[PDB]
Amino acid sequence: FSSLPSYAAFATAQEAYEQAVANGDSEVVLKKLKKSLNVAKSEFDRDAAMQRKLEKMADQAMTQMYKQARSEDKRAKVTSAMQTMLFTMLRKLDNDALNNIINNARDGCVPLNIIPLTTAAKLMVVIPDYNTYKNTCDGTTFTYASALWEIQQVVDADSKIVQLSEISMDNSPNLAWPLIVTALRAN
């Protein structure tokens, strides 16, 4: 606060004050001298309390509106990410079979649970032990959901290759047993 128009008012008021004080004329002339500076120091109080409280509010307004801009940019970012995720995931829809089923609905509505039961081109089965494996995924091909599926890949809880010959009764205790087996819809 030095480039305010009244800083000259300090200049003149205190300059005259010190001049006439070092001169030491009388109090009869010092009354006006010590009242001019007295009203001056109040003038500064007014026009300085009118300014120094403005910078904090301007600064906080810039903070708030800058973070508002940041939030707005993040909004565009998430919009783009969401839309591209939808469009990339839809491209897997395999748009031939699902059309056949939806054409067969009375109005077009079909329960969701049968969409992967009739149209999905891959199956993965998790088996807890060899016994249940015998009942479901024995051999190089099996059946489920009124369809025939053919084995291609088997892994264990450690996501490492294990061959179909390795899953026997006696060799079983040497394997992790949330076994994963993936099969393809045979045609």
**Cβ atoms of residues 139 and 154 within 8 Å:** no
Nearer to other proteins, 40 or 117 (CB): 117
Nearer to other proteins, 68 or 168 (CB): 68
**Cβ atoms of residues 13 and 37 within 8 Å:** yes
Name the residue with tokens 């077009």: 108
Rounded to a whole number of angstroms, the minimum distance from the CB of residue 111 to other proteins is 5
Nearer to other proteins, 9 or 179 (CB): 179
Nearer to other proteins, 2 or 26 (CB): 2
Dist. CA 68–CA 8, nearest whole Å: 41
Nearer to other proteins, 145 or 186 (CB): 145
Note every long-range contact of 139-148, with CB atoms under 8 Å and residues 24 or more positions apart, other chains counting.
140/164, 141/183, 141/186, 142/183, 145/117, 145/118, 147/185, 147/186, 148/185, 148/186
Q: Which residues bind other proteins (CB under 8 A)?
A: 50, 53-54, 57-75, 78-79, 81-87, 89-93, 95, 97-98, 101-102, 105-106, 110-117, 124, 126, 145, 156-159, 176, 178, 180, 182
**Cβ atoms of residues 128 and 172 within 8 Å:** no
User: SS3 for 41?
Assistant: helix
Rounded to a whole number of angstroms, the minimum distance from the CB of residue 45 to other proteins is 16
The partner residues of 126 in beta bridges, in order of sequence, read: 180
Rounded to a whole number of angstroms, the minimum distance from the CB of residue 43 to other proteins is 18
Rounded to a whole number of angstroms, the minimum distance from the CB of residue 137 to other proteins is 15
Rounded to a whole number of angstroms, the minimum distance from the CB of residue 108 to other proteins is 11
